[PDB]
Design a protein around this motif. Sequence first.
Motif, PDB file in Angstrom:
ATOM      1  N   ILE A 141      78.012 -32.368 -13.690  1.00 58.23           N
ATOM      2  CA  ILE A 141      79.328 -32.288 -14.326  1.00 58.23           C
ATOM      3  C   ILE A 141      79.818 -33.712 -14.531  1.00 58.23           C
ATOM      4  CG2 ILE A 141      79.644 -30.074 -13.226  1.00 58.23           C
ATOM      5  CD1 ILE A 141      82.172 -32.026 -11.778  1.00 58.23           C
ATOM      6  N   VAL A 142      78.960 -34.667 -14.142  1.00 59.90           N
ATOM      7  CA  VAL A 142      79.225 -36.092 -14.313  1.00 59.90           C
ATOM      8  C   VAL A 142      78.342 -36.814 -15.355  1.00 59.90           C
ATOM      9  CG1 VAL A 142      79.321 -38.367 -13.230  1.00 59.90           C
ATOM     10  CG2 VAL A 142      80.272 -36.305 -12.005  1.00 59.90           C
ATOM     11  N   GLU A 180      82.389 -46.602 -18.412  1.00 62.61           N
ATOM     12  CA  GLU A 180      83.177 -45.393 -18.323  1.00 62.61           C
ATOM     13  C   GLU A 180      82.462 -44.288 -17.587  1.00 62.61           C
ATOM     14  OE1 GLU A 180      82.428 -43.135 -22.116  1.00 62.61           O
ATOM     15  OE2 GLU A 180      84.629 -43.052 -22.126  1.00 62.61           O
ATOM     16  N   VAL A 181      83.235 -43.395 -16.977  1.00 68.89           N
ATOM     17  CA  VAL A 181      82.683 -42.227 -16.283  1.00 68.89           C
ATOM     18  C   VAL A 181      83.455 -41.008 -16.772  1.00 68.89           C
ATOM     19  CG1 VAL A 181      83.945 -42.821 -14.131  1.00 68.89           C
ATOM     20  CG2 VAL A 181      82.225 -41.008 -14.059  1.00 68.89           C
ATOM     21  N   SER A 182      82.721 -39.952 -17.124  1.00 67.93           N
ATOM     22  CA  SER A 182      83.333 -38.710 -17.625  1.00 67.93           C
ATOM     23  C   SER A 182      82.985 -37.569 -16.694  1.00 67.93           C
ATOM     24  CB  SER A 182      82.842 -38.368 -19.041  1.00 67.93           C
ATOM     25  OG  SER A 182      83.751 -37.474 -19.699  1.00 67.93           O
ATOM     26  N   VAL A 183      83.998 -36.786 -16.380  1.00 73.06           N
ATOM     27  CA  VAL A 183      83.857 -35.622 -15.522  1.00 73.06           C
ATOM     28  C   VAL A 183      84.342 -34.374 -16.266  1.00 73.06           C
ATOM     29  CG1 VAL A 183      84.476 -34.595 -13.306  1.00 73.06           C
ATOM     30  CG2 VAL A 183      84.310 -37.102 -13.570  1.00 73.06           C
ATOM     31  N   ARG A 184      83.482 -33.356 -16.319  1.00 79.68           N
ATOM     32  CA  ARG A 184      83.829 -32.089 -16.953  1.00 79.68           C
ATOM     33  C   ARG A 184      84.578 -31.277 -15.895  1.00 79.68           C
ATOM     34  NH1 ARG A 184      78.720 -29.458 -17.420  1.00 79.68           N
ATOM     35  NH2 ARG A 184      78.539 -30.828 -19.279  1.00 79.68           N
ATOM     36  N   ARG A 229      87.073 -32.383 -20.277  1.00 76.82           N
ATOM     37  CA  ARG A 229      86.534 -33.533 -19.556  1.00 76.82           C
ATOM     38  C   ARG A 229      87.654 -34.484 -19.166  1.00 76.82           C
ATOM     39  NH1 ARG A 229      80.943 -33.088 -19.710  1.00 76.82           N
ATOM     40  NH2 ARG A 229      80.538 -34.849 -18.289  1.00 76.82           N
ATOM     41  N   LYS A 230      87.458 -35.235 -18.086  1.00 77.29           N
ATOM     42  CA  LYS A 230      88.435 -36.247 -17.698  1.00 77.29           C
ATOM     43  C   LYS A 230      87.674 -37.563 -17.749  1.00 77.29           C
ATOM     44  CE  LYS A 230      91.597 -34.063 -14.455  1.00 77.29           C
ATOM     45  NZ  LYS A 230      92.748 -33.236 -14.899  1.00 77.29           N
ATOM     46  N   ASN A 268      81.530 -30.337  -6.001  1.00 73.63           N
ATOM     47  CA  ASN A 268      82.349 -31.434  -5.571  1.00 73.63           C
ATOM     48  C   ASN A 268      83.397 -31.897  -6.565  1.00 73.63           C
ATOM     49  OD1 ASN A 268      80.430 -31.688  -3.227  1.00 73.63           O
ATOM     50  ND2 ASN A 268      79.077 -32.529  -4.800  1.00 73.63           N
ATOM     51  N   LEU A 269      83.589 -31.184  -7.665  1.00 70.97           N
ATOM     52  CA  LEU A 269      84.539 -31.666  -8.666  1.00 70.97           C
ATOM     53  C   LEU A 269      85.915 -32.165  -8.196  1.00 70.97           C
ATOM     54  CD1 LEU A 269      85.888 -31.756 -11.804  1.00 70.97           C
ATOM     55  CD2 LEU A 269      86.193 -29.301 -11.215  1.00 70.97           C
TER      56      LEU A 269
END
Length: 330
Positions: free
Chosen positions: A23-24, A32-36, A46-47, A310-311
């Motif tokens: 999810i990462v 940059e890092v994107s989290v769904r 996504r964040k 772990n989101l």
Amino acid sequence: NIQVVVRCRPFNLAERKASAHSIVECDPVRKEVSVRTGGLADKSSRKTYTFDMVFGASTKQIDVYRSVVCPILDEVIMGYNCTIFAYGQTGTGKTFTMEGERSPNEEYTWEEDPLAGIIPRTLHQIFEKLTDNGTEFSVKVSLLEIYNEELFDLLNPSSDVSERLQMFDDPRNKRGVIIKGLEEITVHNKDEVYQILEKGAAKRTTAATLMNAYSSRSHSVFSVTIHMKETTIDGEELVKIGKLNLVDLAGSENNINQSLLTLGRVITALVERTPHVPYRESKLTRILQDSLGGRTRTSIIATISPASLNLEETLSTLEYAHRAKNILNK
Ligand SMILES: CN1CC[C@H](N(C)C(=O)N2CC(c3cc(F)ccc3F)=C[C@@]2(CO)c2ccccc2)[C@H](F)C1
Ligand SMILES: Nc1ncnc2c1ncn2[C@@H]1O[C@H](COP(=O)(O)OP(=O)(O)O)[C@@H](O)[C@H]1O
Ligand SMILES: [Mg+2]
């Protein structure tokens, strides 16, 4: 000013064989890092966050060491004080990043292990970079760990762990402490590094049996102080003193960790320019007060998991690490 890098780790065997969907996502070049935060890989919310550096699951130890540590060590070797923290939830790679591990089947020597982390690489490099050059120098290390607001010395072979140390303020230099009885060991050569860490590891084992969830709940501070008398090719003799503190923080996940709590509250006060910063409120922030809005060069390495379970924790860690970008020191 404070530099914050993010390191995502790879899925384990239990996650690979269980077909795990990250999810990462990491963009080093975009930092940059994107989290769904929900949905599918087909469609999703996504964040996104931007840090000073980002390392994806593919990042190796050597990568982190060359990219982040080598420049910090050169500063320490310049007579500077530096500190690096590993922050993140348990299972994300704090210890892995800071100490590393050993390759299986006695495959390598401690100097060659691709799995070695910051602490071992660093100590080995000091003796490299200084030995060759014409530098006179001593190297001292100490390993100070905090569990339930108590202090332990993980390197003293004459005492056993259960003996907690006393901390007082330093009447000489303000904003610093004196820890009574803390051992400072001289590392005479590179072939002295390993056995020092062997002993710390050993003691850690006992500490672990004496205290619940020790490895998860304790903060460890491994310090290397470098004393140099460098005589340039000409004849000049520079006397410099550097100190690098390497901090493996207690798990970020949520009894109460007063040092963790205070740490978070100190960052808030620093970034919200509040007059009162609650350093005195915990042992850690008192020890490392100079590292937080002080005259020390500090870096934070935030370790995240790529798994979906772990989101909430990875979100919480990214959010936390982003904020600390706004702490000005040195
Ligand atoms: C049976 N023994 C065999 C040797 C073992 N040992 C010492 C280690 O392998 N290390 C301890 C360590 C370390 C320990 C501290 F206390 C504090 C800080 C640190 F960085 C780093 C690593 C493990 O990742 C390492 C990895 C790579 C190269 C060297 C060391 C241990 F003694 C078990
Ligand atoms: N970047 C990484 N690459 C490969 N394995 C990793 C990485 N980060 C963590 N691990 C692994 O994840 C596990 C838990 O890691 P650990 O370093 O003990 O984390 P923590 O100290 O945060 O609880 C260990 O099995 C370690 O092998
Ligand atoms: Mg750990």
